[PDB]
Amino acid sequence: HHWGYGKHNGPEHWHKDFPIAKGERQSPVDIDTHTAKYDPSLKPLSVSYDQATSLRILNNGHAFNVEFDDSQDKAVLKGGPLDGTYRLIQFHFHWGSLDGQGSEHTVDKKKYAAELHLVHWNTKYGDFGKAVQQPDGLAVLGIFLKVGSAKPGLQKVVDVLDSIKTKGKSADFTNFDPRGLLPESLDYWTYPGSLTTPPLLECVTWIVLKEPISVSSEQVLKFRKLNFNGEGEPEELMVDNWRPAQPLKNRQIKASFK
Numbered sequence: 711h712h713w714g715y716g717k718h719n720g721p722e723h724w725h726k727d728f729p730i731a732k733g734e735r736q737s738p739v740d741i742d743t744h745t746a747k748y749d750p751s752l753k754p755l756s757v758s759y760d761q762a763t764s765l766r767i768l769n770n771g772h773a774f775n776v777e778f779d780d781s782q783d784k785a786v787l788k789g790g791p792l793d794g795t796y797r798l799i800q801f802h803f804h805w806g807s808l809d810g811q812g813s814e815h816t817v818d819k820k821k822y823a824a825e826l827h828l829v830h831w832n833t834k835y836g837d838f839g840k841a842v843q844q845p846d847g848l849a850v851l852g853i854f855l856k857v858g859s860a861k862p863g864l865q866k867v868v869d870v871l872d873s874i875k876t877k878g879k880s881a882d883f884t885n886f887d888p889r890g891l892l893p894e895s896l897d898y899w900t901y902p903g904s905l906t907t908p909p910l911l912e913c914v915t916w917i918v919l920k921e922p923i924s925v926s927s928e929q930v931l932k933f934r935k936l937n938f939n940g941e942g943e944p945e946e947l948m949v950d951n952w953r954p955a956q957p958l959k960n961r962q963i964k965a966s967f968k
């Protein structure tokens with residue numbers, strides 16, 4: 711598989727290797743704020759990241775990923791639409807070549823500069839690989855980034871990117887606190903969807919925060935200096951690593967807020 715984000719191997723092509731690309735619960739989607747309905751049944755969202763244990767940051771040729779120790783319930787997402795306990799395994803971002811694009815979800819067709827995905831797996835399935843085979847296997851917390859003031863809790867990430875410029879590079883990334891990436895409010899939209907990259911599995915409860923975080927132009931500029939390629943390969947800048955909005959089909963997006 712040689713999927714990517716170019717003309718020749720990008721989202722329009724994915725369906726030939728991964729036919730679920732044209733499925734019934736693909737992600738991302740546009741969130742129409744005048745169609746989403748407040749759901750009083752939603753319980754409060756619980757983000758419990760006090761004991762989060764980060765390990766390493768990796769360039770995988772698609773994004774940069776920060777991985778966590780998920781051998782115990784150290785950092786978990788519960789509540790909201792979720793039943794049971796979802797364990798944080800990793801986070802990554804999607805971003806644009808310019809500030810006017812980069813997010814995967816859109817809000818009334820508005821694209822943000824970037825989008826953060828905090829990836830959690832349902833502990834009743836025992837490991838990530840089993841969880842992605844189930845319709846309720848993952849919970850992904852999605853956070854929009856807009857360009858404005860710098861986000862101090864992102865700067866440690868930005869500071870290491872020079873050490874993982876190319877595909878297959880990794881660095882130690884211990885003692886990072888992902889609480890510094892959250893906005894003040896946990897107001898959210900939720901809907902059932904998919905992984906936004908191959909294999910595009912329909913295993914995700916999406917929880918997309920309404921309040922974006924602000925990052926500085928300097929911070930997102932540094933994301934854009936990464937490379938999709940490996941060392942010694944022709945340089946391709948790691949930009950526009952987002953999939954566009956997919957058909958909502960027979961789904962409803964629920965709001966946690968009036």
Ligand SMILES: CCOc1ccc(CC(=O)O)cc1
Pocket residue numbers: 780799831836837838839840
């Ligand atoms: C595609 C499978 O990827 C996997 C990633 C991690 C695990 C183990 C864990 O849950 O941390 C199992 C499978």
Ligand SMILES: CCOc1ccc(CC(=O)O)cc1
Pocket residue numbers: 799800827829838905906907
């Ligand atoms: C353990 C890795 O977890 C992941 C989950 C979803 C994606 C797809 C995306 O949102 O880019 C990538 C990685």
Ligand SMILES: [Cl-]
Pocket residue numbers: 861892893922923924
């Ligand atoms: Cl912020």
Ligand SMILES: [Zn+2]
Pocket residue numbers: 802803804827906
């Ligand atoms: Zn993602």
